[PDB]
Amino acid sequence: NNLKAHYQKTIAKELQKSFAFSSIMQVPRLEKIVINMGVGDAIRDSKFLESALNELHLISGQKPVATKAKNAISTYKLRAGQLIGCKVTLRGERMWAFLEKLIYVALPRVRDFRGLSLKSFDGRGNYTIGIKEQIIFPEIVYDDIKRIRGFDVTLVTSTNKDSEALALLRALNLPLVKG
Amino acid sequence: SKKGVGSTKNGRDSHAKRLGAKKADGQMIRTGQIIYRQRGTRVYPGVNVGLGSDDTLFALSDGLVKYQKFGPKQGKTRVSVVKHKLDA
Amino acid sequence: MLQPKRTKYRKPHNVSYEGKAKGNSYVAFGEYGLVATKGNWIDARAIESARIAISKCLGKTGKMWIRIFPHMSKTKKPLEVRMGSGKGNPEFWVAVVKQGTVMFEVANIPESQMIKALTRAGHKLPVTWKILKREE
Amino acid sequence: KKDFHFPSQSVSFKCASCSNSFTIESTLKQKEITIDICGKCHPFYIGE
Amino acid sequence: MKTRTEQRRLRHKRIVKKIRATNHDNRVVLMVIKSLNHISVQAWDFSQNIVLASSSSLALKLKNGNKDNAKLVGQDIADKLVKLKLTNVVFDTGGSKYHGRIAALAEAARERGLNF
Amino acid sequence: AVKRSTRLGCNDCREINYLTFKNVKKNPEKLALNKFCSRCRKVVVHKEVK
RNA sequence: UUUGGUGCCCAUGUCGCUGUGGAAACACCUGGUUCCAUUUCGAACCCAGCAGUUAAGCACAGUGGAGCCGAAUGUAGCUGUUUCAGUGAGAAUAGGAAAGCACCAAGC
RNA sequence: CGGUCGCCUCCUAAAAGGUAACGGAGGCGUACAAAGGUACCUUCAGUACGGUUGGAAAUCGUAUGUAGAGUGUAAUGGUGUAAGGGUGCUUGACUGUGAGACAUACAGGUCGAACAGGUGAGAAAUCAGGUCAUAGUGAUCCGGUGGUCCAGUAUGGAAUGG
RNA sequence: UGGAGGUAAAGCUACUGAAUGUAUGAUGGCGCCACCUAGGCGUACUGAAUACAAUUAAACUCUGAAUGCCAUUUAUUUUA
Ligand SMILES: [Mg+2]
Ligand SMILES: [Mg+2]
Ligand SMILES: [Mg+2]
Ligand SMILES: [Mg+2]
Ligand SMILES: [Mg+2]
Ligand SMILES: [Mg+2]
Ligand SMILES: [Mg+2]
Ligand SMILES: [Mg+2]
Ligand SMILES: [Mg+2]
Ligand SMILES: [Mg+2]
Ligand SMILES: [Mg+2]
Ligand SMILES: [Mg+2]
Ligand SMILES: [Mg+2]
Ligand SMILES: [Zn+2]
Ligand SMILES: [Zn+2]
């Protein structure tokens, strides 16, 4: 990506000067955006889950691996050995493609993007964005599952302190309230 | 009057398996002799000592048996068969 | 009637009272204590009798601690029953008191009342009691 | 990994008002698909 | 969860334990450790706990990290073993998958008379 | 007692040389293993025999 | 002697905090076109190279915070004979403790 | 009269082993073509934080946590790079044996180095004669089934046996 | 002299149960309000978790003997 080179150049200079970091790679660098489209209807309407997977494929370019629960609950009809939920973890070139595509096309199409920040970091530097609906993503045809869902896009960073992670988001211009 | 008496419900016990150490430290031993019968490895195997389908330690060569305490906080026991090592 | 809420085994082996003093040997909550001089089995009924007696002769500001507790139960075969057919059913709970264990302690009321209070507590118990004070 | 039926191809995206032809890899039609609300066409990102 | 070097040590601990349990004829153990830049080699003996033979890229003075130089390193260590009159050896990796550079080094030892 | 045992017989000399166990309720398909044969003195396929 | 690798050991070897370091090496790192790989991701494994790097890891100095170890005296249980001679714990405590023993390759 | 009768685990059982009572608690008369064999890779439960449906608790990411997780099962013992989880290839859940031992009144039981044949995994070293280990079992007689280099009541067969 | 063990004893911040007091306190009961659902201020009181001090156990153990048991070394004795 040309903006990937832009990422290299821009993040280096500004971050380096903002805290006098003694090495250029001391500045934080983002590693992987995990996507987790999991649904419990696969216990009963298994067919539904299959269609789900294809949409995840169509959004990222990586086929989603379906995850299995580590316990069993009767109230949720859950039992061990079943696959309920797919997770995808993008790295290298593809994750930055998805990140830019999210912030510029998918994200500002959100029905009411008022945004949410400062109250999302987990205390170790991560960040989760809870999307409400899937239809807003461009890579999905009108024909879909009879049920509509959201997303659980999350973020990670090399640093463990939340303030420098916030600094990376501001340097990347991730559009949230005051952050 | 006898008044009658109740009935007991637990009077069953199994044969006592004769586990424990068989060959003591310092004892001469030939190959193929059992050194320790156990339920679960209470004494680890070392050099010249084998294992069976019942976690029974048996020798693999001639020599003198020797127990050595090892492991975290010296809580694990290990057995070995120090060969004769006569070496003229 | 002091009683454990639940126990793992209904019928345990009895616990011996011969020997020295294991724990509860020195006054450490109050400053006067009723020490024992003869190991014996004393049940929760005697605790309640002694505790109610002491409490009645206590005042409005005195405070008390109960050290011993009847952890172990004891059985009794029903009357007119011949030997055999298993162990009896648990009947009453007893605390094991060894020679030297401090059973009751008192504080926060003048000196004369506590000696009398400990006296009536010890007259309710079979063990031969004796008064001790707390080390400075 | 590779050998996939869904190819990640660099598709360009146009928008109204501001053209802003962003080229992003996606598995869609190989042409200038126009988006109606982009990043620059949002009151939150730019414009108080 | 860790870094590659720690994982290689963990796998290396697994292999060393297995060999010490089953090596009954007391052969010398040819442990090769591969790094990002170079690969070195040393032949220990777990009965005496010393090293009988050694070889390395630093000793052989090459810009290593390639499959070509792995054959020469393997050749050097095998030459030392024949002079030492030991040919029955056991070959274990430092905890890395046996492939590529590791395979060239292992194969190089085999054509000059080593037995493993 | 229950009878979960089953027989594995050679397919060359048609000799039964092994005794194993099999669950008819869980596993429905006939075993087609390959084991040593005393007669043929080699490894050969052994199938279930009534 | 120092660095790097490894075996023996299995906290007086740990967890953590504060600083210093790289010549060679150790490492992050640069890319996936080759061998190889992801229950999906060149993250890992595997390649071919050292541009950048001392945050890490790693190695040194300090740090008695957590964890660990723990003397002598005395005591409980034991063996005998005594109603006293040995044997001597656990707990608690002063306190120690920032690992140690060998082999190899390089500048020394 | 009621209860029990065989085998396995713990305590009583007094720190080798053994030790009874109509003493105190429980189980078994199995399960797995993978839960076996091998090569490679990999490591808890829970809790804290952050996140649509989704809720105290489904799944995800990070951190913490030294076993409270798993190891088909009743307990005991063992085991956190293991004996737990996943994948690939396979059937050693082999044939003929078996020095030496444990424990035993006998009958029986338990472990097993090593040899020959032909295989499976693996680069190879090595491992594999069923499973983390201990319950899952019944003598003799009689008859039935398959194979067979033995017999076949004068001889050749057959019957009938071995 | 070497070794196996887990009893007596001791300990329960080293687990499993049982369990006392003090302090901070989840929790409920109890109210009084507002609100019909999100809740709030005190609780005659119940009591999670943590800290301090103290306890109990054949089927509890982070520990932990003596005696006894096995073998070997030396001396002596008996042909069992
Ligand atoms: Mg038993
Ligand atoms: Mg540094
Ligand atoms: Mg009857
Ligand atoms: Mg005894
Ligand atoms: Mg015993
Ligand atoms: Mg169990
Ligand atoms: Mg497998
Ligand atoms: Mg298994
Ligand atoms: Mg008959
Ligand atoms: Mg005839
Ligand atoms: Mg005739
Ligand atoms: Mg005791
Ligand atoms: Mg306790
Ligand atoms: Zn626009
Ligand atoms: Zn055949």
Side-chain angles (χ1 to χ4, degrees):
Chain A
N1 190 331
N2 62 87
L3 187 169
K4 260 297 305 192
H6 165 263
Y7 145 69
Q8 177 272 331
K9 74 150 81 63
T10 53
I11 207 191
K13 30 152 182 287
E14 70 212 41
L15 276 290
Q16 191 60 306
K17 303 188 301 309
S18 294
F19 330 106
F21 269 48
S22 314
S23 173
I24 192 91
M25 93 165 188
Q26 300 238 40
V27 317
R29 59 203 303 217
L30 175 127
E31 320 66 13
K32 53 216 191 201
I33 319 88
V34 159
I35 302 315
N36 178 349
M37 274 329 294
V39 47
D41 312 279
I43 61 190
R44 54 155 58 169
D45 46 74
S46 100
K47 309 132 59 196
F48 272 39
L49 171 136
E50 337 180 9
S51 42
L53 316 167
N54 223 39
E55 259 145 0
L56 288 92
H57 188 11
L58 281 150
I59 189 64
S60 36
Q62 303 215 172
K63 81 164 302 182
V65 59
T67 325
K68 300 149 291 173
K70 295 144 300 145
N71 285 269
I73 308 131
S74 45
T75 57
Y76 298 0
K77 315 174 40 200
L78 166 71
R79 191 86 59 97
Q82 309 174 282
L83 71 90
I84 72 152
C86 41
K87 52 136 271 164
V88 196
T89 166
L90 317 93
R91 314 191 170 252
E93 289 95 54
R94 55 217 315 174
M95 35 75 49
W96 277 106
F98 175 82
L99 178 57
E100 291 287 330
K101 138 180 172 46
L102 171 72
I103 171 175
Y104 274 30
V105 152
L107 185 60
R109 179 187 341 161
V110 156
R111 190 210 46 62
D112 169 40
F113 186 131
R114 271 291 300 103
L116 194 54
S117 48
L118 280 300
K119 191 61 78 67
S120 203
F121 303 115
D122 85 348
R124 310 308 204 286
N126 315 343
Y127 188 92
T128 59
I129 324 185
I131 280 44
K132 272 264 167 25
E133 287 305 4
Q134 87 290 15
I135 310 116
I136 55 197
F137 269 32
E139 287 47 50
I140 51 136
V141 315
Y142 42 70
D143 250 347
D144 46 5
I145 292 166
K146 289 173 174 171
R147 166 74 290 131
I148 58 176
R149 290 182 283 273
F151 300 109
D152 270 35
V153 66
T154 165
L155 303 317
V156 308
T157 82
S158 324
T159 181
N160 46 20
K161 183 167 252 313
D162 255 23
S163 76
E164 314 66 357
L166 177 60
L168 177 275
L169 326 186
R170 299 302 332 113
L172 203 37
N173 286 23
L174 187 50
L176 297 316
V177 300
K178 286 327 303 203
Chain B
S1 35
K2 323 271 306 308
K3 182 173 197 156
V5 284
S7 100
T8 89
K9 84 168 81 73
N10 52 41
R12 295 148 324 288
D13 211 342
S14 56
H15 280 306
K17 308 309 269 198
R18 280 141 177 61
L19 288 293
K22 303 292 143 173
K23 295 263 151 143
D25 193 355
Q27 287 213 337
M28 256 209 88
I29 59 134
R30 287 203 263 121
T31 206
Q33 307 211 30
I34 87 185
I35 205 177
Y36 206 94
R37 266 195 198 272
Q38 24 167 337
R39 303 271 90 169
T41 168
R42 276 188 81 86
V43 166
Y44 273 58
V47 277
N48 314 155
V49 152
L51 274 166
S53 174
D54 283 298
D55 297 318
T56 300
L57 308 173
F58 70 110
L60 290 182
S61 96
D62 287 329
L64 314 167
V65 46
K66 159 56 82 165
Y67 295 150
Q68 203 85 312
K69 159 166 292 173
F70 85 107
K73 218 188 221 176
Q74 320 279 40
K76 316 259 189 184
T77 302
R78 65 177 340 275
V79 85
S80 147
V81 171
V82 201
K83 283 171 295 322
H84 286 347
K85 188 212 69 62
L86 308 186
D87 310 350
Chain C
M1 162 295 298
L2 307 205
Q3 206 206 299
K5 292 198 213 147
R6 152 173 289 123
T7 278
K8 201 174 199 251
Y9 298 137
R10 283 145 47 51
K11 312 142 140 162
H13 285 164
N14 81 8
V15 172
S16 79
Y17 50 70
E18 61 295 6
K20 305 263 154 162
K22 184 71 190 294
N24 304 33
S25 312
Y26 51 99
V27 202
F29 285 101
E31 45 62 36
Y32 267 124
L34 198 73
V35 80
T37 44
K38 190 206 64 193
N40 212 308
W41 279 322
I42 70 108
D43 43 326
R45 279 156 44 241
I47 301 327
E48 299 312 26
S49 163
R51 189 213 102 251
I52 300 314
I54 198 189
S55 173
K56 262 176 303 152
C57 68
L58 191 56
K60 54 180 42 182
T61 180
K63 92 159 296 300
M64 185 157 31
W65 295 261
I66 311 304
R67 297 284 275 280
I68 72 167
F69 194 86
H71 297 283
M72 294 320 78
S73 147
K74 284 209 65 80
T75 165
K76 196 139 184 21
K77 273 184 45 181
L79 181 130
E80 289 188 335
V81 200
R82 205 220 202 271
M83 306 293 187
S85 34
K87 193 169 188 183
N89 165 352
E91 296 315 280
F92 49 92
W93 284 247
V94 305
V96 56
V97 163
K98 286 181 173 59
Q99 186 186 12
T101 62
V102 172
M103 21 173 57
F104 302 139
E105 303 199 355
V106 285
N108 325 61
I109 180 48
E111 200 43 9
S112 65
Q113 279 299 331
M114 330 187 312
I115 298 148
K116 189 231 310 197
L118 308 197
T119 296
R120 321 294 173 163
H123 277 142
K124 295 310 203 190
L125 321 181
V127 314
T128 305
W129 50 273
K130 134 166 191 183
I131 312 106
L132 269 283
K133 194 212 281 327
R134 208 210 319 232
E135 305 178 344
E136 284 208 354
Chain D
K1 188 111 164 292
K2 196 72 221 73
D3 300 6
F4 252 117
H5 70 317
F6 285 16
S8 165
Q9 77 157 311
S10 210
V11 52
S12 39
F13 266 120
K14 198 155 272 280
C15 174
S17 153
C18 44
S19 270
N20 295 36
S21 212
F22 301 121
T23 168
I24 284 150
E25 311 55 29
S26 324
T27 166
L28 311 177
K29 167 44 165 33
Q30 329 215 354
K31 79 103 208 173
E32 182 68 326
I33 313 201
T34 285
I35 187 50
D36 192 312
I37 289 184
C38 80
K40 282 65 183 85
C41 278
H42 202 280
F44 197 9
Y45 306 0
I46 315 97
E48 160 59 350
Chain E
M1 102 305 298
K2 305 146 128 202
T3 62
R4 298 169 344 261
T5 186
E6 330 203 45
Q7 289 316 64
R8 189 197 62 240
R9 298 170 191 284
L10 218 38
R11 292 166 277 187
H12 199 358
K13 283 295 303 318
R14 255 134 59 178
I15 39 180
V16 63
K17 194 199 310 300
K18 188 162 67 150
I19 86 183
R20 244 170 210 274
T22 88
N23 69 326
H24 277 174
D25 88 11
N26 218 20
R27 298 148 292 230
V28 77
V29 46
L30 168 69
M31 79 155 187
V32 315
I33 299 95
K34 87 181 192 184
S35 85
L36 87 169
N37 313 317
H38 312 177
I39 330 303
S40 54
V41 154
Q42 52 197 297
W44 282 66
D45 64 339
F46 295 139
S47 34
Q48 173 84 330
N49 294 39
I50 64 200
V51 305
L52 272 284
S54 186
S55 147
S56 83
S57 99
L58 300 211
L60 281 280
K61 182 195 57 43
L62 320 87
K63 173 190 121 68
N64 178 353
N66 320 294
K67 215 149 46 187
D68 67 280
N69 313 82
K71 284 112 150 148
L72 46 91
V73 178
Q75 293 167 269
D76 173 42
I77 189 43
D79 173 322
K80 184 59 75 45
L81 263 293
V82 315
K83 180 259 291 191
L84 267 206
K85 325 200 311 303
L86 295 302
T87 43
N88 44 337
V89 308
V90 75
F91 180 98
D92 81 64
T93 87
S96 297
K97 208 175 66 47
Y98 174 23
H99 189 245
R101 292 178 291 177
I102 283 297
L105 206 167
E107 281 314 330
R110 319 197 144 292
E111 52 301 323
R112 174 200 300 81
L114 275 197
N115 174 257
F116 73 77
Chain F
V2 79
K3 318 279 172 70
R4 331 295 298 286
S5 312
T6 80
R7 297 248 184 190
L8 250 71
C10 172
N11 84 324
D12 310 337
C13 52
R14 279 76 49 83
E15 211 65 2
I16 303 85
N17 55 301
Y18 292 105
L19 165 40
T20 45
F21 298 83
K22 176 87 212 300
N23 275 235
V24 164
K25 154 163 152 197
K26 201 74 53 183
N27 311 66
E29 64 311 347
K30 184 152 306 288
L31 296 199
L33 264 59
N34 43 6
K35 314 211 73 193
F36 193 68
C37 185
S38 302
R39 252 207 173 175
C40 315
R41 271 184 58 67
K42 49 174 99 104
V43 52
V44 305
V45 67
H46 289 55
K47 44 136 181 61
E48 185 44 51
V49 304
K50 185 274 190 163

